[PDB]
């Protein structure tokens, strides 16, 4: 309006790039998932690919080579929060 301002850290950290090693490491942890938990991985790509949101989970190949860095960061969270977690209960 008559005034405005910026400086929010959201825009500068939207999604960092993903190296070949990141994409490969993510594949290893994905390969450790049980069948009933692996079919949830494909749904993460549908959350980024509207072009894949009407395809079968068994007809969607995971091409780290065509997918966006942001997609991989979401997938990485799923595995790292499945195989591990951050809680210190009492």
UniProtKB/Swiss-Prot annotation:
PTM statement from Swiss-Prot or TrEMBL: Phosphorylation by CK2 disrupt the intramolecular binding between the bromo domain 2 and the NPS region and promotes binding between the NPS and the BID regions, leading to activate the protein and promote binding to acetylated histones. In absence of phosphorylation, BRD4 does not localize to p53/TP53 target gene promoters, phosphorylation promoting recruitment to p53/TP53 target promoters.
Cross-link (Glycyl lysine isopeptide (Lys-Gly) (interchain with G-Cter in SUMO2)): 53
Residue ranges, compositional bias (Basic and acidic residues): 13-23
Native source species: Mus musculus (Mouse)
Role of this protein: Chromatin reader protein that recognizes and binds acetylated histones and plays a key role in transmission of epigenetic memory across cell divisions and transcription regulation. Remains associated with acetylated chromatin throughout the entire cell cycle and provides epigenetic memory for postmitotic G1 gene transcription by preserving acetylated chromatin status and maintaining high-order chromatin structure. During interphase, plays a key role in regulating the transcription of signal-inducible genes by associating with the P-TEFb complex and recruiting it to promoters.
Extra information: JQ1, a thieno-triazolo-1,4-diazepine derivative, and I-BET, a benzodiazepine derivative, have been tested on tumors with success. Treatment with GSK1210151A (I-BET151, a I-BET derivative) has strong effets on mixed lineage leukemia and promotes myeloid differentiation and leukemia stem-cell depletion.
Entry remark concerning the domains of this protein: The NET domain mediates interaction with a number of chromatin proteins involved in transcription regulation (NSD3, JMJD6, CHD4, GLTSCR1 and ATAD5).
Whole-protein coverage range: 601 to 683 of 1400
Phenotype caused by lack of the gene: Embryonic lethal. Embryos ndie shortly after implantation and are compromised in their ability to maintain an inner cell mass.
Protein name per its UniProtKB record: Bromodomain-containing protein 4
